[PDB]
Amino acid sequence: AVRVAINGFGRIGRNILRAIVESGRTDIQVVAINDLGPVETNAHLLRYDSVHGRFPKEVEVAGDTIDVGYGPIKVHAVRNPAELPWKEENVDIALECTGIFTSRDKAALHLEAGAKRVIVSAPADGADLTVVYGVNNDKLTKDHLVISNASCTTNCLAPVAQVLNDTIGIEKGFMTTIHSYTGDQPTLDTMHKDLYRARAAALSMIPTSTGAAKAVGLVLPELKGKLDGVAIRVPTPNVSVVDLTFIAKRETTVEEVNNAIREAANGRLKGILGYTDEKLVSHDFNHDSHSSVFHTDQTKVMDGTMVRILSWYDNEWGFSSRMSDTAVALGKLI
Amino acid sequence: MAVRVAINGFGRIGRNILRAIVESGRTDIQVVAINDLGPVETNAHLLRYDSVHGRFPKEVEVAGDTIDVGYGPIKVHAVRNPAELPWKEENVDIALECTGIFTSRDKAALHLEAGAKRVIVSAPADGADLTVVYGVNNDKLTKDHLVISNASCTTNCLAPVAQVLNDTIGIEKGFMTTIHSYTGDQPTLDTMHKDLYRARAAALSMIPTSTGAAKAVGLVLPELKGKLDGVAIRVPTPNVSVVDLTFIAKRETTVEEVNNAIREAANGRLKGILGYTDEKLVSHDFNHDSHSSVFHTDQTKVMDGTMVRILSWYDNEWGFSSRMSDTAVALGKLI
Amino acid sequence: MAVRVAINGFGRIGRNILRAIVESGRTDIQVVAINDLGPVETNAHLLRYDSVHGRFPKEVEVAGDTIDVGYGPIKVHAVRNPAELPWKEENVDIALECTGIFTSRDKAALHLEAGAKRVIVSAPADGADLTVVYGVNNDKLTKDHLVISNASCTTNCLAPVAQVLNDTIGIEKGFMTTIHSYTGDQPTLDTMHKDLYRARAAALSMIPTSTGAAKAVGLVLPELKGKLDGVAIRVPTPNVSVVDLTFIAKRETTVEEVNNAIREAANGRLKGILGYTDEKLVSHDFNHDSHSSVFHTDQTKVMDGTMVRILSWYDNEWGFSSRMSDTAVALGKLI
Amino acid sequence: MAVRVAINGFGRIGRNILRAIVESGRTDIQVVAINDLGPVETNAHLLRYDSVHGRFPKEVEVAGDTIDVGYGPIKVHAVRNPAELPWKEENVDIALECTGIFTSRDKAALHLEAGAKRVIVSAPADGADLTVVYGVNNDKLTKDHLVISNASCTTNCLAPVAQVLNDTIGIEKGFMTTIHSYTGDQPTLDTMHKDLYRARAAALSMIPTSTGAAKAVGLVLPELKGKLDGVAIRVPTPNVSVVDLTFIAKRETTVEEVNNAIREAANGRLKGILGYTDEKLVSHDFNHDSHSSVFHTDQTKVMDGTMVRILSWYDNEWGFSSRMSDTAVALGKLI
Ligand SMILES: NC(=O)c1ccc[n+]([C@@H]2O[C@H](COP(=O)([O-])OP(=O)(O)OC[C@H]3O[C@@H](n4cnc5c(N)ncnc54)[C@H](O)[C@@H]3O)[C@@H](O)[C@H]2O)c1
Ligand SMILES: NC(=O)c1ccc[n+]([C@@H]2O[C@H](COP(=O)([O-])OP(=O)(O)OC[C@H]3O[C@@H](n4cnc5c(N)ncnc54)[C@H](O)[C@@H]3O)[C@@H](O)[C@H]2O)c1
Ligand SMILES: NC(=O)c1ccc[n+]([C@@H]2O[C@H](COP(=O)([O-])OP(=O)(O)OC[C@H]3O[C@@H](n4cnc5c(N)ncnc54)[C@H](O)[C@@H]3O)[C@@H](O)[C@H]2O)c1
Ligand SMILES: NC(=O)c1ccc[n+]([C@@H]2O[C@H](COP(=O)([O-])OP(=O)(O)OC[C@H]3O[C@@H](n4cnc5c(N)ncnc54)[C@H](O)[C@@H]3O)[C@@H](O)[C@H]2O)c1
């Protein structure tokens, strides 16, 4: 079992722990947690969840300790990641989930503190490698010390872009992800570095940026420079969607698009790529641990070569699950 | 000299047709009757207080079966069958059919049986003598078109942008996703519905849904027939929608060319119908904007010189309700 | 052994009764029939997928006009009027009336003609042989009671608190405001309605509304007649409500006494029906909780010894649906 | 004779103080200085476009470090510590403290150190020389009060109602729950916060919370010291709030007497401050209403002559921001 610490006990941080517990997985153990508050507040935030419900197991608090079923977890409050006791606690991997230490050189402070590897829960400027689990995690080597788990959007688009490109070919494509609001937006209109993201989150559709599409051109090099995209933030607390229109290299059909996703889903990317043949809506994919769930009924083909698809993602649950798969795979190279 | 009109179905659009006439100060049209399914006071109450547009900017006087908003009594009805209305007596030039239940052309045609001289449907109308997007094809109206359709809110958003961009650089093929506000045909909580998507609690999810608006551009621009398709996604906002469009241009172009061609038209031929913003705005800033379509310059992308994406906002209540009036006035002149 | 039940109207109430029976594992009641006028496939889809309660955790097999949730086919019918139902053929012990259309005793009782032996209406029911809050006046049911009301979500939340506190300290006078989640009978957007309050966009406002729950407690608990009044305020949430009650005690008391009296009730006589929390929880934390009433200790207030304020949550869907079954099990024993 | 003001903290309240001034046309006050934490152009952009109040009605023009709203350049700063703001230089009569971050007398008074002659805190302030609800106790101001509090939005709503009733029929004892719109100090999603309630996602729940507004009346109105207690529940609306008050009268009363004592104050000495409605309105209807408190008449109830419940609405943003200017004008005359 690889030893991990969670830095930033937030939406991703807490859910990383929750997914581990809810699965019984034994390949990974969380040994410490760090945020900026009382141990008790961390425990209470874990216990009660406005999106996913109540925590399924008792949550025990002992001094500086948290226990969720398998022994106490050392809990901290250290602003500077380089001051953490990673050596003394023998941390194989630091999972960096604050939002503020995403460049390689900052994420690396965990290495200074004593962790052997670092995984940033987001795009990472200067990452030794950027990973979409199930797609390119076999590129990890003994070389990479500080890597990125990509963004929730990249983890949803890449598996779909990969299969379809392998099947039918992608000449050129444009993505708009319609995303649930997120903690880096305000409840009401207020001073912000980004004028779109300044705006009341549950009140509008809000145009926003995202490197997800170009980023896929890097986790799948064969799609270098062929995809571009943006986002629209809307009034939902959790769950998002990818709406991608692209040109196929050869003429195709709705059926062939659908079928190719099904075979991939039931075979090589099982658990990572999924699909529904039903008429579902966003909330239906709440608490689904797939990176991507392809909406069969939404496939469109215009004039042989123009293709539209829709794929869902639980931006919290799916991604937090991958943070674990990625860590277990990274620990094995140590 | 003003066209005499009657609103059938005093819902989100029937109310805002009236309200927009009043806010705009327009003298060319006049509402002379209103019909719905309830007491006069209830209708007045819903005109007075709006959850999305706010309070009615003027007093609303009720006296009998009548409503006064500044200019004299408006006769108010409560008749389920459209065939039974006193359109001939009250001298209705044009009935505006807004219930959402008489969009069929022979169903709309009941307003002529009842006495109106012409009919406009506030939606796509199957079998309409003509379908119109004001500013794009109101020129094709003739003295013979008797029961026309004002298209949909989404169609009035898309067609003016398609027309400009096609005239200027050429559209080969494209796909539309409208992210649209939820509407009165969806429920609060999940429940029995003919469409499995729309059965779902409306303010709780992103809800993919069906729409023929892109294909319908083909009805107002034959040049464009068969070249556009699209769908919708409804989201938890109560008003204001947006067209997100990715298409293949006939020649290489650039972000700048596209925005530019849009400004030119917005500032000239299509002033008031197609507008644009160069600022970083979000959907609520367009609440109560009367444009059919407001192009969002910043969001314009171009990939490999010929794949082009655009984003254009509409107030689905407000623009569309304003255009209902523009269309009735034009039609009125041909009577 | 298990009481055999039929659900009339597979709207939300009806579906959640089923889901609650299945999720709990209980063995004392069984749904053997459903009657509804919409399509069997749509009803299965709505059982499978809930936007408030989430994914139903068992397989749902459609096989013709039948549905199987894990114990055999459940016949689904469509029969306009409840006297025409084949309740005799089907061996129904109790029809659960959940349409919202058949609430009066004489209407609900058509099910008795249709062949069933008892009827339970899932709301207040005019002229009911008895009105039940399970856990409170559960024991006043007889062999002679043939058509009953399971009262309302708010009443099942209030009566248990009122009873404990009245027994312990005494209630002279009180006023209840229930801050309630919006519900299926409110519209998405402003529109024609009998009640002008309920005409307003449901998720855009705090909306004042009347409720009969405080009167109704004076009936379940006769010693409290004329003692309690109240009203509601609907707010933009899809599920979970709360009772905010302020009353005058018969005698001086304290915060700790009030809370302590609730805990001893919840941990004994009223287990599973009235619960409490000693933590700082919010409304979503009670989503999908089967209690009728969950007392919020932290929110208890006393001033000048005798004016008391309390706060108690209810999942207005899930608690009430469980009680439907608890009530029916008991009714069955009297058959 | 126009009081010169600086707005420190250009947030919901800050921006709307400026907006109410422009909109009213009033000429007794002049904003001469704005301070926040970001670029001039960002401050201007948040003034231009407002998700709750809509677009700014006048042009918002930027030149260098100044914005101009129709009446000449307002100087714009970005300075974190208030002791450094050039208040002396710029002849500031009254610094309006609106950051939420300097509410205690010693932090608020840093503005006096900087050059301002007076300070009004836009919230409860520990140690304030006086706490003012305009319309109620502003006659109590003296030339001697240097640092003052304008109370809370809730106290400005409750105090006028409490005054009228108390003066008319007496208040022995009351309890208050305010149902309140979420504000900027709550998160979009569950996250670390110093208060375990307010840590929870803001638009997802009914969230019980702490307020001193009921006690604080007790000291705009000494006759009422120690007689009222209260608490809050935040719910998923972005603006507009309500007071739900239940109290013991000093004598027997009626629904009718309670209501017309309010009408009379509202139409007489409390005009513009306390208003009322006789109609069936909902929260959104009071968006952008400048009253401090608008009494909802149909909601008055009386239990056994002496138990009285009432409901009164407040736009927590728009009403309070207007009062800030009113209070500023009064204070300025005493300098
Ligand atoms: N929420 C999502 O949908 C999602 C999905 C994919 C990726 N991500 C990425 O994951 C990261 C976190 O996202 P989130 O949604 O969990 O945000 P969040 O705000 O919920 O979590 C951030 C947490 O870090 C804590 N924190 C701040 N500074 C700290 C410090 N110096 N030391 C320790 N803790 C500190 C905060 O208290 C907070 O609890 C971001 O980079 C985000 O982009 C988020
Ligand atoms: N809401 C929009 O953004 C929008 C935009 C463009 C077009 N439209 C179209 O306009 C039409 C109405 O839309 P809406 O949002 O105003 O719906 P709505 O539900 O708000 O309005 C329908 C109104 O008609 C009344 N009505 C129903 N049956 C009637 C009958 N038998 N006789 C008289 N009145 C009757 C109802 O009471 C209701 O007030 C629909 O066809 C819709 O597709 C709507
Ligand atoms: N939902 C709650 O929290 C709750 C709580 C307490 C009491 N109640 C009461 O329970 C009743 C139902 O509530 P609900 O929320 O389930 O409403 P709902 O709208 O979800 O359910 C109504 C269902 O009955 C069906 N129906 C309507 N007319 C019918 C008829 N003619 N024949 C057969 N089926 C018909 C509809 O298709 C729908 O599925 C109401 O009286 C309500 O007051 C509900
Ligand atoms: N929003 C309401 O309904 C309301 C009502 C009545 C009273 N109040 C009180 O008014 C105050 C502000 O409320 P708000 O809703 O406008 O909050 P807000 O967050 O919307 O506004 C606060 C503003 O102050 C700025 N700021 C923070 N630190 C600063 C500093 N060091 N120097 C200068 N500016 C700084 C922030 O950038 C922000 O623009 C609070 O005390 C609040 O309790 C608010």
CA dihedral C252, C257, C259, C262 (to 10 degrees): -100
CA of D185 to the centre of ligand 4 (A): 9
The CATH code of domain A1-150+316-334 reads 3.40.50.720
Topology classification of domain C1-151+317-335: Rossmann fold (3.40.50)
Give the residue range(s) of CATH 3.30.360.10 domains in chain C. 152-316
Quick one: chain C helix, strand, coil %, rounded to 5?
30, 25, 45
D152-316 sits in which CATH class? alpha beta
Cα angle, residue C185 at apex, residues C184 and C191 outer, rounded to 5°: 120
CA max distance for chain C: 66
What residue spans in chain D does CATH classification 3.40.50.720 cover?
A: 1-151+317-335
Burial tier of D239 (Cβ tally within 10 Å: 0-12, 13-18, 19+): buried
Smallest CA–CA distance, residue A230 to chain D, in Å, is 22
* CA–CA separation, A193 and A191 (whole Å): 7
CA dist., res. A312 & res. A282, Å (int): 7
Rounded (5°) CA angle D76-D81-D83: 95
Count each helix (H run) and each strand (E run) in chain D, helices first: 8, 17
D38, D184, D196 member nearest A186 (Cβ): D184
Q: Which residues of A78-112 are buried (b: 16+ CB within 10 A; e: fewer)?
A: eeebeebbbeebebbbbbbbbbebbebebbbbbbe
H/E stretch holding C3 reads: strand C3-8
- The rounded distance, in Å, linking the Cα atoms of D213 and C79 is 56
Residues of chain A with CATH 3.30.360.10: 151-315
Gap from CA of D123 to ligand 4 centroid (Å):
9
Task: Give me the torsion for CA of D265, D271, D276, D281, rounded to 10°.
Answer: 180
Question: In this structure, are residues A108 and A84 in contact, taking their beta carbons and an 8 Å threshold?
Answer: no
Using CA atoms, how far apart are residues B104 and B98, in angstroms rounded to an integer? 12
Single out the residue of B280, B202, B208, B195 nearest to residue B237, CA to CA. B202
With a CB cutoff of 8 Å and minimum separation 6, the contacts of D80 are D37
CA-based radius of gyration for chain D:
20
Q: Which helix (H) or strand (E) holds C294?
A: strand C293-296
Residue C256: partners with Cβ closer than 8 Å, 6 or more residues away:
none
Q: Which residue has the CA at smallest separation from atom 37 of ligand 1?
A: D192
Helical ranges in chain D per DSSP H: 12-24, 40-48, 105-108, 110-114, 153-169, 213-217, 255-267, 318-333
Helices and strands (H, E) in chain A, number of each type: 9, 16
Phi and psi at B198, nearest 5°, equal -80, 5
Q: Is B220 in the pocket of ligand 2 (CB under 6 A)?
A: no
Rounded-to-integer distance, Cα C165 and Cα C156, Å: 15
Cβ atoms of residues D33 and D7 within 8 Å = yes
In 10 A of CB D218, how many CB atoms?
A: 19
In which order are the strands placed within the sheet that holds D130-131?
Answer: D61-63, D66-68, D73-77, D29-35, D3-8, D94-97, D118-121, D147-149, D130-131
- Could you say which of A44, A50, A182 has the minimum Cβ distance to residue D205? A50
Pairing state between β D147-149 and D118-121: parallel
Measured from the Cβ of residue D324, the count of other Cβ atoms closer than 10 Å reads 27
Among the bound ligands, the one closest to the CA of D212: 4
Cα gap D181→A179, rounded to integer Å: 24
Radius of gyration of chain C (CA): 20
* Ligand 2: nearest atom to the Cα of B121: 41
The token duo for A97 is: 């989930």
Instruction: Please report which residue ranges of C267-317 form alpha helices under DSSP H.
Output: none
Which ligand 2 atom is nearest residue B9's CA?
24
Choice among B153, B171, B220, B245 that is catalytic: B153
**Rounded Cα gap, residues C77 and C43, in angstroms:** 11
Residue type, C4: R
Q: Do D244 and C248 touch (CB under 8 A)?
A: no
CA distance A101 to D232: 37
In the chain, the amino acid numbered B41 is E
Contact C188 B192 (CB under 8 A): no
Q: In sequence order, what E strands does C98-206 have?
A: 118-121, 130-131, 147-149, 171-181
- Exposure of C93 in the CB half-sphere (CA atoms within 13 A): 20
Q: Are B181 and B152 in contact (CB under 8 A)?
A: no
Cβ-contact C45, C67 below 8 angstroms? no
Among A41, A182, A195, beta carbon nearest to D196 = A41
Experiment used for this model: X-ray
Q: Do A153 and A163 contact (CB within 8 A), yes or no?
A: no
Q: Where do runs of H (alpha helix) occur along B142-273?
A: 153-168, 217-220, 255-266
- Angstrom distance (rounded) from CA C50 to CA A287: 13
Residue with tokens 């947690």: A33
Who lines ligand 3 at CB under 6 A?
Answer: B 191-192; C 8-14, 35-38, 98-101, 122-123, 152-153, 183-184, 316-317, 320
Q: Are D269 and D287 in contact (CB under 8 A)?
A: no
The one-letter amino acid code at D321 reads: S
- For the segment(s) A151-315, the CATH number from 2.60.130.10, 3.30.360.10, 3.40.50.300, 1.20.1440.230 is 3.30.360.10
Distance of alpha carbon A256 from alpha carbon A261, whole angstroms:
9
Look at B284 and D54 and tell me if their CB atoms are within 8 Å. Answer: yes
In the numeric block, the tokens 């023009």 are attached to: D61
- d(CA A179, CA B230) in angstroms, rounded, equals 20
Kindly list the residues from chain B whose CB atom is less than 8 angstroms away from the CB atom of residue A279.
Answer: 196-197
CA A195/CA D137 separation, integer angstroms = 41
D153 catalytic per annotation = yes
A14: nearest CA partner in chain D? D191
How many angstroms separate the alpha carbon of residue B38 from the centre of ligand 2? 14
The residue count for chain C: 335
Provide the CB-side half-sphere exposure for C110 (13 A, CA): 16
Tell me which residue has tokens 């949730």: C69
Q: Which residues of A fall within a CB distance of 8 Å from B197?
A: 279, 281
- How far separated are the first and last CA of chain B, in Å rounded? 12
Contacts 24+ apart (CB under 8 A), B107-111: B107/B82, B108/B147, B109/B147, B110/B81, B110/B82, B110/B83, B111/B8, B111/B82, B111/B85, B111/B87
What does DSSP say about strands B307-314 and C61-62: parallel, antiparallel, or unpaired? unpaired
* Alpha carbon of residue D164 to chain centroid: 20
Residue with tokens 């050596």, as numbered in its chain: A87
Q: Do A284 and C45 touch (CB under 8 A)?
A: no
Which residue carries 């209260």 as its tokens?
A: D230
Q: Is the dihedral of CA C122, C123, C126, C129 positive or negative?
A: positive
Interface residues from chain B to D (CB-CB < 8 Å): 45, 49, 51, 54-55, 279-282, 284-285, 287-288
Q: How many CB atoms lie within 10 A of CB B26?
A: 15
- The residue nearest atom 21 of ligand 4, judged by CA position, is D11
B236 burial class (0-12, 13-18, 19+ CB within 10 angstroms)? buried
